[PDB]
From a paper:
OphP is an essential enzyme for the biosynthesis of the macrocyclic peptide natural product omphalotin A. The enzyme has been proposed to proteolytically release a peptide intermediate from the precursor protein OphMA and to macrocyclize the multiply α-N-methylated core of this intermediate to produce omphalotin A. Our *in vitro* experiments demonstrate that OphP does not process OphMA but shows robust macrocyclase activity on pre-processed α-N-methylated peptides. OphP tolerates sequence promiscuity in the substrate but has a preference for highly α-N-methylated substrates and for N-methylated glycine residue at the catalytic site. The promiscuity of OphP is explained by structural analysis of co-complexes which reveals a predominantly hydrophobic substrate binding cleft with few interactions between substrate side chains and OphP. Similar to other POPs, the monomer has two domains, an α/β hydrolase domain (residues 1–82, 453–738) and the seven-bladed β-propeller domain (residues 83–452) ([Fig fig4]).
We determined the covalent complex structure of OphP with ZPP by soaking wild-type OphP crystals with 5 mM ZPP overnight. The structure of the complex was determined at 2.0 Å resolution. Additional electron density, which we fitted as ZPP covalently linked to S580 (**Figure S11**) was seen in two subunits. The overall structure of the OphP:ZPP complex is largely unchanged from the apo structure of S580A (0.5 Å over 716 Cα atoms) (**Figure 4-Figure supplement 2**). There are differences in loops Leu139–Ala146, Ser164–Met171, Ser179– Met195, Pro222–Gly230, Leu696–Ser706 and Ala622–Tyr664. As a result, His701 has moved closer (7.6 Å to serine) to both Asp665 and Ser580 to form the catalytic triad (**Figure 4-Figure supplement 2**). The carbonyl at P1 proline of the ZPP(acyl)-enzyme intermediate hydrogen bonds to the backbone amide of Asn581 and the side chain hydroxyl of Tyr499. These results confirm Ser580 as the key catalytic residue and suggest a structural re-arrangement of active site residues including His701 upon substrate binding.
Residue numbers in the entry: 5 to 731
């Protein structure tokens, strides 16, 4: 007797006709099309959001395990967190720090040579440089990025107010840190520079430290609460001390408003790379200019790097006229190649060949002539050292560590700081010093979590057959003392797309779920990701997207068949592209799943191109307005494939979405929740929408909101699957 669902107005006439290769045309009905109108523009959308919000709150709050979860999460989340040390041109190391339950990581610094005094029981040490929590009253304003002037006197930084893809760029002196005395709701100590209407932090200082390049868009009233396509990306140069109105236009392309464009300077500041993107594929239109020839503006001598739309190019470094690129040019797994700007017609020369069995994730220069490569092989990271001059192998480092690495250190430094993490390791900072034949490794600092004994857990590697017989890898994290007797709950997380690998990643909350509910945490490395190189992505996109859903369903069947999980206690979870996975799998195999968690899900696979950044995803999903693509998209589009109610028991489903979410428009969740509640008015399992009116994502917003969302998710799974919380 948790019902009834709040009513939702239907438009029974609303339909769009799509061209179809098989059927000539298909008229598709959308009775909830009015919920495409943003919250702030429609009283109907407002009434839907408020009624669904209130309904979900009432259901979630009637479970006593919700408060129990909130308390469990507050205790366990209260641990000291930090990044590796990042060396900067002002002669300081910078590091992120959280004392425990602050919304945003704070930026601390220490004089190079004094770093052995930081991150102790006494506290972070060094000096507090920047506290993003001070920027807002709610802790929802976040640092989107930062870059120091080459001179080391200035610091350019991005702030997004409500966690949307809108930010302003500020500048402050490196002599002007945030003082501890200062209170919330202000950014004291900044210079007057304010760069508005930015949607991504790609910022390059000129070597004269007089100004920086940036990308911006036309102004927008509904600041991240609109859902119009993101259009008319422009490159500008800002001179320090000038109003944004004086900024010089570097590039615009009015013919192609859907293109995204940015510039990047080589570390020397001599060469500028222009890159335009027309979709989510790893392909660019690229141009190089030599800043020793040009004054900044629309009068720069742009040179051809390579034919457009064949490859992506990222700067690794430069040596005079030679530029080092990480590129996928005739190499889908990426490689390192050099360009001589003095011989453009010779094109690119291979320095490090493509590895046919490993995705090259990053390439960086250290100790003058050591090339550090991070490879993704078999769904985890490997570090290889190469000679910059010859490309000759100089050996592996951190081979004994299975997980992922974040590498800090510049070409002029003999040292790197490497943050290692996995499903079981929250964060170990190693220091590595390059030598002639071998280096020196030391453990600098390790994150400890008082609230949880990590030795109680194990991560295994299994391989399971998908529907088509493809062998898929899965990671299984679990408590060592849990019996595989077919009674355990599972939390099964998937994404499957955009060459994004699900690599070993530390999540405290997930391990608390495993301990408290005696549960298994399953990460199937399904197609669409880069776990087995770029071909793994190709086998899970466009007309092969169904492979992703089949891989995920087969993972669940395997866990049940091999007694890892109860048939009655499978919870699946996914976000963004992961939401196509959760909603498709719920439609295609509702009987496998007891609980489905969808975070900012993409669900309407016909209408996705019409909103914010959606048109770029046509490279991944296909173009719904193309007759050939329409047929394979329409087969799985979860919004259009909700099972007929008479012979399906739909799982319990909880949808998270945000008001400022301009990445995936909330309308996806709005319409699907409306449709599910309409199809299954009597459940028996509830379909709920949990909305945050004050963020545009679910990480790097207020700790209060994050705790409540997690307490809602875990308490909802507990209720839906009939679980008891263990001490
Ligand atoms: C989440 O998975 C959504 C839905 C499908 C793909 N996607 C993304 O967020 C993709 C994947 C990586 C980044 N991305 C994206 O949309 O970036 C475009 C962009 C957004 C904001 C500024 C600049 C570019």
């Amino acid at each position: 007797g948790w019902g009834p669902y709040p009513p939702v107005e239907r438009d029974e006439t609303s339909a769009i006709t799509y061209s179809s290769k098989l059927h000539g045309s298909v008229t598709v009905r959308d009775p909830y099309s009015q919920l495409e109108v943003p919250f702030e523009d429609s009283e109907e959308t407002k009434a839907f959001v408020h009624s669904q919000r209130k309904f979900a709150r009432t259901y979630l709050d009637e479970n006593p395990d919700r408060e129990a979860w909130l308390e469990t999460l507050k205790k366990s989340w209260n641990y000291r967190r930090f990044s590796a040390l990042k060396p900067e041109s002002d002669g300081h190391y910078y590091f992120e720090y959280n004392d425990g339950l602050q919304s945003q990581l704070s930026l601390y610094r220490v004089r190079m040579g004094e770093e052995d005094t930081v991150l102790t029981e006494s506290g972070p040490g060094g000096e507090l440089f920047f506290n993003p929590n001070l920027l807002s009253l709610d802790g929802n304003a976040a640092l989107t990025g930062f870059v120091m002037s080459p001179c080391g006197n200035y610091w350019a930084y991005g702030v997004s107010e409500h966690g949307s893809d809108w930010m302003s760029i500020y500048v402050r002196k490196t002599s002007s840190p945030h003082l501890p005395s200062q209170e919330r709701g202000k950014d004291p100590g900044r210079m007057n520079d304010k760069i508005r209407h930015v949607r991504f932090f790609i910022v390059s200082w000129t070597s004269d430290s007089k100004g920086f390049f940036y990308s911006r868009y036309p102004p927008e009233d509904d600041e991240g609460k609109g859902n119009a396509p993101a259009m008319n990306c422009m490159v500008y140069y800002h001179r320090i001390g000038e109003d944004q109105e004086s900024d010089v236009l570097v590039h615009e392309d009015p013919e192609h408003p859907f293109w995204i464009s940015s510039v990047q300077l080589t570390p020397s500041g001599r060469y500028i790379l222009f890159a335009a993107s027309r979709d989510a594929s790893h392909t660019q239109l690229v141009k190089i200019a030599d800043l020793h020839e040009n004054d900044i503006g629309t009068n720069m001598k742009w040179k051809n790097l390579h034919d457009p739309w064949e490859a992506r190019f990222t700067i690794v470094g430069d040596e005079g006229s030679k530029i080092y690129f990480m590129t996928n040019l005739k190499a889908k797994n990426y490689k390192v190649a050099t360009f001589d700007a003095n011989h453009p017609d010779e094109g690119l020369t291979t320095l490090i060949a493509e590895d046919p069995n490993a995705f090259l994730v990053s390439a960086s220069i250290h100790a003058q002539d050591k090339l550090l490569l991070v490879y993704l092989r078999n769904a985890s990271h490997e570090i290889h050292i190469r000679d910059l001059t010859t490309g000759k192998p100089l050996g592996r480092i951190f081979e004994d560590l299975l997980g992922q690495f974040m590498v800090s250190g510049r070409r002029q430094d003999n040292d790197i700081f490497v943050l290692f993490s996995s499903f079981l390791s929250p964060g170990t900072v190693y220091r590595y010093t390059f030598g002639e034949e071998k280096g020196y490794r030391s453990l600098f600092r390790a994150i400890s979590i008082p609230g949880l004994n990590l030795d109680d857990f194990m991560t295994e590697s299994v391989f399971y057959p998908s529907k088509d017989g493809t062998s898929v890898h899965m990671f299984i994290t679990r408590p060592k003392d849990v019996l595989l007797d077919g009674t355990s709950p599972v939390l099964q997380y998937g994404y499957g797309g955009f060459s994004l690998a699900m690599l070993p990643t530390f999540s405290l909350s997930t391990l608390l779920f495993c301990k408290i509910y005696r549960a298994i945490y399953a990460i199937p490395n399904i197609r669409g990701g880069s776990e087995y190189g770029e071909s793994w992505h190709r086998e899970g996109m466009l007309d092969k997207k169904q492979n992703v859903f089949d891989d995920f369903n087969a993972a669940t069947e395997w866990l049940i068949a091999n007694k890892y999980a109860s048939k009655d206690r499978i919870a699946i979870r996914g976000g963004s592209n992961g939401g196509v996975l959760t909603t498709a799998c719920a439609n295609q195999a509702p009987g496998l799943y007891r609980c489905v968690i969808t975070i900012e899900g993409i669900i309407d696979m016909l209408r996705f191109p019409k909103f914010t950044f959606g048109a770029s995803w046509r490279s991944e999903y296909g173009d719904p307005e193309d007759p050939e693509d329409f047929d394979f998209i329409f087969k799985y589009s979860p919004y259009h494939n909700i099972p007929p109610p008479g012979d399906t028991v739909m799982p319990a489903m909880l949808f998270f979405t945000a008001a400022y979410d301009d990445r995936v428009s909330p309308l996806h969740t709005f319409k699907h929740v409306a449709a599910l509640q309409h199809n299954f008015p009597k459940g028996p399992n509830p379909c709920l929408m949990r909305i945050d009116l004050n963020s545009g994502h679910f990480a790097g917003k207020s700790t209060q909101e994050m705790l409540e969302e997690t307490a809602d998710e875990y308490s909802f799974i507990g209720k839906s699957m009939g679980l008891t919380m263990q001490t």
